[PDB]
Structure 1
């Protein structure tokens, strides 16, 4: 305890502190002396004590959805550096889209008194929106929203509609007119948003799409498997499918193999995410890339700012995606005709 180091140090605690935090000038002797005792006495200042005083834990919370999915894990890993190089402590908590679950992690959140709050709950029902607001006191920012759903938070928008668009365009220019689509859950942004972007181009190109060629996915490889399966299992099949996510595409890739179909010789897959190891998919995945890092870093920053600069007004910064050409896509049967 400080009372213990000051003692061994034959100096006031006020002194022990002033040297611990270089908050005011202290003679060299006194300085050194404190230190020695600090070391021999083996002192570890109590952050909890210091925070009960200074009104800030210096730790930010993460109300995530899950932490194993490649997509998530990369953002999550991104944040942590940011937290660390800026002095913060990361508190991770996955709600699994569970209201109860979130209401709890949110609960312990404020209790432990997180200086700030990063959110990625995926689905945002009225109930959620509700609970979230009752903590509008604690600074926060949702990082996975299509557009600014609330006025009480900060947001980083991905322009995922623009991405869904970019993907379809590619297919078109490639020669395809018979595309399919295994989208991510519609309650989601990266779900509906991407699909909706992809579908503008279609109409923009008078391309229709039979319902039998559009199957819901949940970002789980198993789901990609089942869809791709469902797709090619019907008499008339498309020549190129737009896969809602990379790890789903990764799963759709598998099925086509066991299918006996070649890729991209038989099917053309265009994903979306650009996961750390999508380049090494087999084959190499052509895909849309989301700036996961910046989506992360940008978030942490807005928080700090709102924090340290006692910001009060909400905000929302956009981020942008870009096509990444790999090997899952070939020319369509209309390429030369354009």
Structure 2
């Protein structure tokens, strides 16, 4: 079809391609004519041909976990902004923590020859770690580990643990000594990592959390609903609660309400994530905020670098969580005694 263009214009495809990409000077006269044709013929230059030659697709792949999930969704929207910004195309792939699913997208991707790979897989068993390596040749950055699991990738770290700690501290300095926790999946960073951050502060304060007070969630609202329940559904309950994620929080919220419990007047809740609309949670949610735009833009950036300035060595940038005080927490019994 560029051949067809060259012809309508009576110039060489070379000339055509020169004008279409301003890659060498062309007489105006000639230049307009190309356009002229470029426009009657209704020409859409083929990137597949181009990429075929120039060897890069100006396209990047997101090998994600899921995308409805608020938290996720937010990061992704971010990353896409950056792609569009710097002229890249985003191929979105959810593998739902499925390994096969994952080996499958990985492959489709390599085959479609993405210029780089952004990874958000949530859990990283040796077998996944392994497949990932088989692709060290395509540049890539995992945006969700807490420390650096591998030497063949760029890593952006969230300081999830320090976030965990922040949370604890708050409750503590608020008068709280009877706290419970609904962590998220321990095989995840934002899972384990936040729990431990929280657990240091406790240990530091000589607060012990009775195992009947810690209930695993999975970041989905229903998980928090049951958690809260099981907690408040007991003889002795805590005065305050640290919930691993806002969405679950939001579930913890509804259940308390359903047992006729008042938050924060009857139970205090502090979440984690600071999702776009936690402020409209009801009681406005006090939570730890996770930089998600920066987590995205930063990730894109390390990838571009590698991609463009052909980097070889792995790199890692930290990011920082930070407390947002909202309306879900109240003074505990010890506030005054400190």
User: How far 1:45 moved relative to its partner?
Assistant: 0.2
Q: CA deviation at 1:255?
A: 0.1
Cα distance in 2, alignment partners of residues 37 and 163 from structure 1: 59
TM-score (norm 1): 1.00
List gaps (5 residues or longer) in structure 1: none
User: How far 1:117 sits from its partner (Å)?
Assistant: 0.3
Residue 323 of structure 2 aligns to a residue whose secondary structure is strand
Which whole-Å CA distance do the structure 1 matches of 2:311 and 2:229 have between them?
50
Shift, 1:293, TM fit: 0.3
Alpha-carbon displacement from aligned partner over 1:38-76 (angstroms, at most 9, x marks no partner): 000100000000000001000000000000000000000
- What are the ranges of 5 or more consecutive residues in structure 2 without an aligned counterpart? none
| Other-structure match for 1:272 | 272
Residue 294 of structure 2 corresponds to 294
- 1:121 corresponding residue in structure 2: 121
Deviations along 1:189-247, one digit per CA (max 9) or x if unpaired, are: 00000000000000000000110000000000000000000000010000001000000
What residue in structure 2 maps to residue 42 of structure 1?
42
Partner of 1:272, secondary structure, is strand
> In the aligned structure 2, how far is the partner of 1:322 from the partner of 1:259?
31
Secondary structure of 2:202's partner? helix
What is the deviation of 1:165? 0.2
TM-score by length of 2: 1.00
**Alpha-carbon distance, 1:157 to partner:** 0.1
SS in 2 for 1:66: coil
CA–CA separation in structure 2 for the residues paired with 1:261 and 1:234: 13
Deviation at 1:178, TM superposition (A): 0.2
Aligned equivalents of 2:2, 2:37: Cα separation in 1: 10
Q: Deviations over 1:149-180 (max 9, x none)?
A: 00000000000000000000000000000000
Q: CA deviation at 1:11?
A: 0.2
Q: Tell me, in whole angstroms, the C-alpha distance in 2 between the residues paired with 1:75 and 1:184.
A: 18
Where do residues 131-210 of structure 1 align in structure 2 (5 Å cutoff)?
131-210=131-210
Query: Aligned-pair distance for 1:29?
Result: 0.4
CA distance in 1 between partners of 2:35 and 2:209 (Å): 73
Distance 1:191 1:271 in 2: 13
SS of 1:137's partner is: coil
Distance 1:87 1:13 in 2: 25
Secondary structure of the 2:278 match is: coil
Runs of 4+ residues deviating >4 angstroms:
none
Number of corresponding residues: 338
Structure 1 residue 319, shift from structure 2 partner: 0.1
Cα separation, 2, equivalents of 1:327 and 1:244: 17
Specify the SS of the correspondent of 2:136.
Answer: coil
- Shift of the alpha carbon at 1:2? 0.5
RMSD: 0.3
